[PDB]
């Protein structure tokens, strides 16, 4: 029972330890990293996702989303308004303009205070959920497009490809661009690499305390709780760290810099924001340990959020001795 305080652990793999992705995930879990819900991984010195980040200005952001928030005192609901297509070059210019740029700050505590206090103002534009990857095909270690985990069973056994789940998503962010409180689809793991730019702050609740966050969310959004039994699947709730601390919700905060990986573990609730212009890439993955989490993931009741995929192939192939038991439990 390592990591008793559910601290966010930072890992420094050697070049050799960076070869087998699944093996390093298991090593991190042997150290209790998953208890925090998130871990940071610093890649070895000479490792690189790609040679250079030139020629990225021409990338198409077909549907940038304006993230409109409404609320106050650290509790907000966010909705996405569709905007017209832009290039990464135009987006970077907009992010670095006087209206959207990172406001002056003394330190993190000051920037964090400005983000939570002024959230309803100057609704940021997020170049989120773009199908694609910036990892060079030559990169053979921790290439998000080719992690080689058991999640490959979805496409291998069923021919099912879901954008962002088993294919990478690119995210071009700007100051105040936000990711609302959520666990991954099917309570999968996720991995995020910050290719370039300004930091990304993450808030994370330890998986053992996930229900405490759900209880607080039900009390903060009573209308949403009456309509859906898993409304955090909607991914629209913003809850500040001050509100978490006031309500005794255990959490940790860590900031991710460019060149660093962040891994989220099954049922690790997380939320955060981008400090300024940046580009991150993310994808889901799975291990044999996740199958029990996937089998029990609470799904959206109202239909606003999807039931991403069936657990059938995973149970039938990787837990065959428990397949009939799983089937009887599904009715
Ligand atoms: Ni996530
Ligand atoms: Zn719902």
From Swiss-Prot:
Entry-annotated residues carrying PolyADP-ribosyl glutamic acid: 16-17
Major localization listed first in the record, in broad terms: nucleus
Binding site for Zn(2+): 228, 234, 300, 302
EC number(s) on file: 1.14.11.66
Residues reported to bind Fe cation: 182, 184, 270
Domain JmjC: 136-302
Annotated localization: Nucleus
Keyword Nucleotide-binding appears in the UniProt entry: no
Protein name as it appears in the record: Lysine-specific demethylase 4D
Provenance organism: Homo sapiens
Full-protein residues shown: 11 to 341 of 523
């Amino acid at each position: 029972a390592q990591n008793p305080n559910c601290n966010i652990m930072i890992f420094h793999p050697t070049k050799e330890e960076f070869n087998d992705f699944d093996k390093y995930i298991a090593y991190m879990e042997s150290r209790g990293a998953h208890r925090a819900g998130l871990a940071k991984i610093i890649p070895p010195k000479e490792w690189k996702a790609r040679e250079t980040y030139d020629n990225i200005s021409e990338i198409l952001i077909a549907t940038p989303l304006q993230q409109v928030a409404s609320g106050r005192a650290g509790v907000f609901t966010q909705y996405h308004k569709k905007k017209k297509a832009m290039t990464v070059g135009e987006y970077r210019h907009l992010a670095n303009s006087k209206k959207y740029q990172t406001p002056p700050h003394q330190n993190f505590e000051d920037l964090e205070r400005k983000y939570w206090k002024n959230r309803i103002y100057n609704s940021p534009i997020y170049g989120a959920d773009i199908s694609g990857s910036l990892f060079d095909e030559n990169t053979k270690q921790w290439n998000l497009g080719h992690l080689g985990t058991i999640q490959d069973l979805l496409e291998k056994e069923c021919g099912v490809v879901i954008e962002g789940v088993n294919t990478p998503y690119l995210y071009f962010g700007m100051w105040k661009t936000t990711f609302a409180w959520h666990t991954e689809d099917m309570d999968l793991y996720s991995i995020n690499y910050l290719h370039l730019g300004e930091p990304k702050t993450w808030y994370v609740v330890p998986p053992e305390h996930g229900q405490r966050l759900e209880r607080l969310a039900r009390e903060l959004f009573p209308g949403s709780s009456r309509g859906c039994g898993a409304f955090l699947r909607h991914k629209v709730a913003l809850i500040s760290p001050t509100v978490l601390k006031e309500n005794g919700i255990p959490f940790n905060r860590i900031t991710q810099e460019a060149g660093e990986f962040m891994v989220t573990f099954p049922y690790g609730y997380h939320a955060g924001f981008n400090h300024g212009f940046n580009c991150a890439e993310a994808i889901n993955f799975a291990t044999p340990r996740w199958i029990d989490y996937g089998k029990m993931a609470s799904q959206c009741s109202c239909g606003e959020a999807r039931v991403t995929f069936s657990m059938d192939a995973f149970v039938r192939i990787l837990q065959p001795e428990r397949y009939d038991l799983w089937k009887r439990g599904q009715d």
